[PDB]
Amino acid sequence: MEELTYRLFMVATVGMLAGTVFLLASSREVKPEHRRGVYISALVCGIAWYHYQKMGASWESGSYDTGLRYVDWVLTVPLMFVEVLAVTRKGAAYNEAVRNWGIAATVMIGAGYYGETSAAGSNEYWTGFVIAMATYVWLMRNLQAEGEGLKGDQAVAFENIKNLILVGWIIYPLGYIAPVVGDFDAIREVLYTIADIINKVGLGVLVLQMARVQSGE
Ligand SMILES: *C/C=C(C)/C=C/C=C(C)/C=C/C1=C(C)CCCC1(C)C
């Protein structure tokens, strides 16, 4: 398990870089007015690339720092919401949701960090899990309600974005609890890594697809 976890960190590092530069190279495929989300998706993968290089080194040392993962999350999750909410909102409605969902994400990630750095299975560990889970469910319920009025190819492309988040983000609470299900500390890190690749590279691909649709392709 320890070597598998290291290898996955190394592969994910190159994968985040590939996502970054793939998305940048692909921006010419859509109209200028629809490139912003693609560029933000590239920024998300680029920040992740930076932190994945650090996480692989940290894991390899034998004294791993989950703070690297959590700082990456706290910076990137609000950016992902910026991309999502721009599809359905502008102006006042956009500003309100970006702020409120960003605050919620920060609470979720901070509660998780508090719990994960507590003794596994302790009241503190479960306190962080429960607070994070409630905030997560609030976010997912808000997301489900977004764009329910859309029709046509834009509706389908937005539903694909929503579904990636609604399904893919379940991996994170599963990773968080893995170490109390078995001798699975490394499996937490495996699951977080797989999740970050799926969610960050996948969202970028789907934001690019949305931009193709918005461009009339
Ligand atoms: C790019 C990274 C992403 C999208 C990270 C997402 C992280 C989460 C949705 C984390 C959620 C958690 C819970 C719902 C409960 C346990 C604590 C967390 C922070 C792992």
Author numbering: 1 to 217
Question: What do the authors report?
Answer:
Using the rose-form crystals, we obtained two different structures of the O state: under the proton-pumping (pH 8.4) and pumping-inhibited (pH 4.6) conditions at the 1.4- and 1.09-Å resolutions, respectively. We will refer to these structures as the O* and O states for clarity. At the same time, the extracellular part of MAR turns into an almost fully dehydrated region because of the FG-loop closure (a key role in this process is the formation of a hinge in helix F). It can be concluded that the structural and spectroscopic data of the rose form of MAR allow assigning this state to the late O intermediate. Apparently, the O state is trapped by the crystallization conditions in the rose-colored crystals. Fortunately, the O intermediate state of PRs harbors a retinylidene Schiff base with an all-trans retinal, allowing it to be trapped in the dark under certain crystallization conditions. Compared to the structures of the ground, M-like, and N states, in the O state structure, an additional water molecule w6 is incorporated in the HBC between Glu83 and the carbonyl group of Lys200. Glu83 and w6 acquire two conformations. In the first conformation, Glu83 makes an H-bond with Ser41 and w6. w6 is stabilized by Ser41 and w5. In the second conformation, both Glu83 and w6 break their bonds with Ser41. Unexpectedly, the His-Asp pair remains protonated in both O* and O state structures, as indicated by the H-bond (2.7 and 2.6 Å, respectively) between the residues.
Here, we have functionally and structurally characterized a representative of the PR family found in a widely distributed clade of marine actinobacteria, Candidatus Actinomarina minuta, named MAR [marine actinobacterial rhodopsin or MacR (16)]. In summary, the sequence alignment and the photocycle measurements confirm that MAR is a member of the PR family, which functions as an outward proton pump at neutral and high pH. Overall, MAR consists of seven transmembrane helices, A to G, connected through short intracellular and extracellular loops. A retinal chromophore is covalently bound to Lys200 of helix G. The fold of the MAR is similar to that of other PRs.
